[PDB]
Symmetry: D2
Subunit: 243 residues, 4 copies
Amino acid sequence: VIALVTHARHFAGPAAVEALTQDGYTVVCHDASFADAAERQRFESENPGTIALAEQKPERLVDATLQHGEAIDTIVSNDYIPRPMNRLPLEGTSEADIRQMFEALSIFPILLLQSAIAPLRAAGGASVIFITSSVGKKPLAYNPLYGPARAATVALVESAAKTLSRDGILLYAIGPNFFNNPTYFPTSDWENNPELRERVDRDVPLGRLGRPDEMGALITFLASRRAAPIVGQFFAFTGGYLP
Amino acid sequence: VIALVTHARHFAGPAAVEALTQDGYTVVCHDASFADAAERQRFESENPGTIALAEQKPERLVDATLQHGEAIDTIVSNDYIPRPMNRLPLEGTSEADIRQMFEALSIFPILLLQSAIAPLRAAGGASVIFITSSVGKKPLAYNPLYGPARAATVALVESAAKTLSRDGILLYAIGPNFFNNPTYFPTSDWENNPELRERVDRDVPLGRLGRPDEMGALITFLASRRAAPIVGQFFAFTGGYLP
Amino acid sequence: VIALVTHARHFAGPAAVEALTQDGYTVVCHDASFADAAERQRFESENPGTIALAEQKPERLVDATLQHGEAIDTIVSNDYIPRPMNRLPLEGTSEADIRQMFEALSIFPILLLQSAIAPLRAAGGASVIFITSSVGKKPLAYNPLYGPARAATVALVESAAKTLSRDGILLYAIGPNFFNNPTYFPTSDWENNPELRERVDRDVPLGRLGRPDEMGALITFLASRRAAPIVGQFFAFTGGYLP
Amino acid sequence: VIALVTHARHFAGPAAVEALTQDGYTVVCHDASFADAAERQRFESENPGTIALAEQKPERLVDATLQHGEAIDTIVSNDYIPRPMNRLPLEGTSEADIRQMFEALSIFPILLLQSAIAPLRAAGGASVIFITSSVGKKPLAYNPLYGPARAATVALVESAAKTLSRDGILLYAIGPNFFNNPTYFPTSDWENNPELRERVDRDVPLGRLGRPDEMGALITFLASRRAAPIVGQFFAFTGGYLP
């Protein structure tokens, strides 16, 4: 049983890879660094139960994946943009950086999903879980471009799920914030930045960063299809910060 | 491990009991019919793994439950209002029916939660899952009173969770619609009422009623606390009808 | 033209009275202190163009108002709970206080509304504006009971509108926060509570309390019915605190 | 006093121009057809109070506008995509159409707003009103690409408002549906399609299309800043179809 995880080495990738693999999935992984055959050898060696794709184009990941199996049971569209770009203000930010925000967080996932419809349907169903952000639903002052791009994809989940659910393709969006991940809240920031500790104690009801195994637990639960009726919505993964 | 499920013979009750019980929990159940000793014995015989309470007051359920264990891991506040009162319109509806709508769907839950804080926190934490309704978030023309009351309890979850999450008491709200359940969408209805089939074919992307085992999956997932960071929010259980 | 403003001396009452009267309305006023004749007389003297009602029952205010006019063009359902009950927590709060929150903020406006349908319909329409609060939409940790109750009335507006709009009865909800008003954010608190001033600086984009005349204009705007298509929704009045 | 209205011959452009010029504004207009001198002249002659811009680039409209006045009081970023493109499905749509949907609906308005900040600020403030769509907040099965695009711009307003409001730059988003306009619900459509008549009967509480003057009403109201505390919110304009 195979799953596809994108941007495997960033954001929610590690948490996704680990959970699925522990659940018995063979995890086909995509990552920009995989354009380097050495990095693929490294990744698969350090990550038993995985296959590192060389494919870099969003519309071609599904076909590259299918070379390793009859069907794709689950896709985790693990889209991101590197810190500190997530905090790009409006004033002063280049047109090229704005275009890039939409390319990485909006267009890439649309092309990936568009390409995955025919195969996933022919297979009888699958689950497509988009990792977005709390801002794809609720606005933050320092995220004036990152929000709109993340928002575009949560809408994509909500609208497309209206037709794809009838084909057994279950779409979901997860909206993290205050999530211990290498991109936005690495362990070292928490360990070395009291300011982040004070913000969490102040704004996160749970009182702590969310763990990657919890992220993975949610990933695996949705991948199970056991609660199919919650299809088509955005799930806050923020420790009570949202709503 | 004990869980408490209220109005056990209605709404999400059967699904809740079956799943928790199936997952190893000893499920202490509440229900108005249990004031009768014979009904309590019959229920326990028909549902191995359960203890039926005689107690009927919302504020006394937690203490009655603790006579059966040291602590409560999960509470399913399965609140409902007998059909067809869910569809009571504003015009011509008596004051009494208006207050019963709030008593059964808003006041009762607050009174249960309220009485539950001290004991749950002293035990180190737990989950409290309110079974509400999709109208607790998105209005329906035929639910102008049933919505206001369901909306009150979803609000209760969102606010109370900002503070209780810190004591390890995790609050959630599940909002069903088109969920095969004895109170609002019994099997007899799906089997004999063309109209329901038409509505589902027209407005539920999933194209069918949600199954009890799917509501049981969701309840038991949340019960595990494996995905704690999604605490304090409302989950639609409508097969895509919502958002 | 005649308008009905409830709890005229509190919350958004003064804003509404001043603005509807500046607009030419003969504003019929309800208030708990009007059971006292001398208060009714001091209020009409201080507020020209106002008629003070002795009536205290939600279901009777409309017929009482009709004694001064052939029709009600606008109803401003200014519901509130006496300060500081708005901040009552979940734990340790008495059942009586919980009942009173729902009585003031949810039952009373429903009884009023219900009583207004037939006559506002026979008149061929009107506007009904419920002043609720930001927690009618988004949770605040310190409003776990006042929140749920406002959430009920906001849902009442959204549901009831689906049918009433057809009769020309246009419902709306305004949910203020940090709105300069005699009750929750009085000029007295702003001048003597540096913490409030700091919290507004930090959390409110407009950087200040909304003025009473700003409220009045939103209300005078809605009453004019010149933009009827925005019927049935909640309007945040927080200077950007929401969403 | 000047107002800038984009894509003035489409969507909400006509309503805006008529309303703002009637309200005393010199309305500077942008439109793809104004690349042609003849169209600008015919447009100027038939719309007293308007100035047609030859400028076609989003980030240059503000400077072009400023050749006609000292400041810009209001900007109406009326973005649209021609019908039937709004209805493009996810499957089979070209990458070019996908990209064009975002360019017209999200990237053009971002470039605009971005360019307006410095001057709008130095002038002490202004209002910026974005016409988006109901799918900017709620999904429709037939708008899986138009929706995302629109949602990014509602997200832009809500996030950007958090910082711009302090500068007196007030952002709003209006989301129509069932609004009589030349692009999505033209009068000839209404008069000639009994099917649209019946849907509206069925799904619009108000029972009819919103009128061009009601769009102008709302726009004129926002533009006066009389109710500045409602800044940074999305306003449904659907006759009650939403929420």
